[PDB]
Amino acid sequence: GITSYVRTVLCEGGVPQRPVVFVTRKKLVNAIQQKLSKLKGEPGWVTIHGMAGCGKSVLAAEAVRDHSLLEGCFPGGVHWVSVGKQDKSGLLMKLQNLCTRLDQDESFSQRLPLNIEEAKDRLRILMLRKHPRSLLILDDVWDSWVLKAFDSQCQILLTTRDKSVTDSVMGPKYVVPVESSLGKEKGLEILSLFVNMKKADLPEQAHSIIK
Amino acid sequence: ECKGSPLVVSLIGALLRDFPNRWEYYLKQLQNKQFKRIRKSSSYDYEALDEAMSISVEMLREDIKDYYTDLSILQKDVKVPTKVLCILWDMETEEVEDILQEFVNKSLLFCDRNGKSFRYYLHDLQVDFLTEKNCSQLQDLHKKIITQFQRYHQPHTLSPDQEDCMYWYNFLAYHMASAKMHKELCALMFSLDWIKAKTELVGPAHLIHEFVEYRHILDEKDCAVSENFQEFLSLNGHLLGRQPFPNIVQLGLCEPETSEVYQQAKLQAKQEVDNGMLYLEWINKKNITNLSRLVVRPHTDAVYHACFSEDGQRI
Ligand SMILES: Nc1ncnc2c1ncn2[C@H]1C[C@H](O)[C@@H](COP(=O)(O)OP(=O)(O)OP(=O)(O)O)O1
Ligand SMILES: [Mg+2]
């Protein structure tokens, strides 16, 4: 049960809304969230990983989707960044864009840094004062210097495919590892939603394809 | 092996986080002495410990840079008297110290302010890096130092007062081995008088230790000569050190067979004899003495007890 307020914080954050055809993974979401709860304060990084298309992002979106962990724990808003895969130049822009996003007031200089580190300063400072209890989520990430760039000393959680990526970084690191499996009961649940029929009404063919 | 470079410990330690089972492997790996095997991504800015040292070496001005390599030859744990560095360099002493002072600042060579004398030396890690990065040269240079010493003091021309000489006893023997020059090695270690002076201030243990190293270096046939000499030493330990270093040349003519040690003695005796010295020949050796393998006098004062190490390595 999403609170109306949760959506309001989430909209500001910019996390994608969950696909209309989804199926909770209560145990997994619960684990990330309880673990996610763990770094109550002081920096910290969380890595989530799986072979391609394991529900890795949706869980990240889903975990924060809940009110309890987020509201009591996280007075700071949540900011989502879609890192992707980047050459050094490309990475630079994302940083400026995060700069513009975070500084809604514009009190900070309209001029944007031409240097990565300066952006790192704007992030750290902004996280430190402007958004004291903020959590940053990342999407993908394929090389370490990238997290080197985002290494603001403020909690950022990166979700990915390589688990090697967060080795440059410093501070407590925890990993929740998503095996690509799912549940036969659940997929039937998912298939039903996809074709809109009582699960039993589903044809004999359906059972086998899920295998 | 770590020698306290916390970078090595974290480097080994993290390395183990992944593979708890391969515990011995890295042990033997560091026993290997190569650091190319150990690598971890880390907060620290380098894949490995070898990685750090390379960064330090580059900065030195080209004129200085060549010199460090010469510095490579020096033992892991020897505080060498400045002079020997002067000799290899062939550069005057007031000057030589200062370049080394610049190194010490580069933190690539630790200082030793013992009295007027200065002994510089390295960390085990620093030494290991050198062989790792300078090994091909080292065999070649090993022959450079010796020739320079030849341009100065001869081993017989060596003296007790000179500061450098003990390094020269203790380790000159060492350099020739790397040199791989066995005939020169014969020119030095064999010399009985060199043994005399060495046993005069060194004692009769270092030579034995050198000999074991010596055996691989030269020839199997000589090895017998070394076997004959070791046999000549067996009689040395018990009374040789005292003081009245009894004219060995006279006490030497006691060995059996002949070998190379006995051959030397008879000729020496013949040389002595015409001049005088009233040496008395001995005619019964083959008929007498069941020789013990070794004798030790640890104390001028009567022994009361002795015990083997449980390992058996020492007593
Ligand atoms: N309830 C659900 N949980 C997880 N995935 C779902 C669900 N319902 C549908 N899906 C499908 C549709 C989406 O395309 C996909 C979710 O994408 P996601 O798990 O974020 O992949 P990903 O982002 O880890 O891939 P990549 O590793 O390429 O980034 O799974
Ligand atoms: Mg993704």
Swiss-Prot record, chain B:
Signal peptide (from-to): none
Induction comment: By E2F and p53/TP53 in apoptotic neurons. Translation is inhibited by HNRPA1, which binds to the IRES of APAF1 mRNAs.
Tissue expression from the record: Ubiquitous. Highest levels of expression in adult spleen and peripheral blood leukocytes, and in fetal brain, kidney and lung. Isoform 1 is expressed in heart, kidney and liver.
Domain of life (superkingdom): Eukaryota
Cellular localization per UniProt: Cytoplasm
Subunit structure: Monomer. Oligomerizes to a heptameric ring, known as the apoptosome, upon binding of cytochrome c and dATP. Oligomeric Apaf-1 and pro-caspase-9 bind to each other via their respective NH2-terminal CARD domains and consecutively mature caspase-9 is released from the complex. Pro-caspase-3 is recruited into the Apaf-1-pro-caspase-9 complex via interaction with pro-caspase-9. Interacts with APIP. Interacts (via CARD and NACHT domains) with NAIP/BIRC1 (via NACHT domain). Interacts with CIAO2A.
Miscellaneous notes: Physiological concentrations of calcium ions negatively affect the assembly of apoptosome by inhibiting nucleotide exchange in the monomeric form.
Domain notes: The CARD domain mediates interaction with APIP. The monomeric form is autoinhibited in a closed conformation through a bound ADP at the nucleotide binding site. Exchange of ADP for ATP and binding of cytochrome c trigger a large conformational change where the first WD repeat region swings out, allowing the NB-ARC domain to rotate and expose the contact areas for oligomerization.
Free-text function comment from the UniProt entry: Oligomeric Apaf-1 mediates the cytochrome c-dependent autocatalytic activation of pro-caspase-9 (Apaf-3), leading to the activation of caspase-3 and apoptosis. This activation requires ATP. Isoform 6 is less effective in inducing apoptosis.
The protein, known as: Apoptotic protease-activating factor 1
Organism expressing this protein natively: Homo sapiens
Whole-protein coverage range: 316 to 630 of 1248
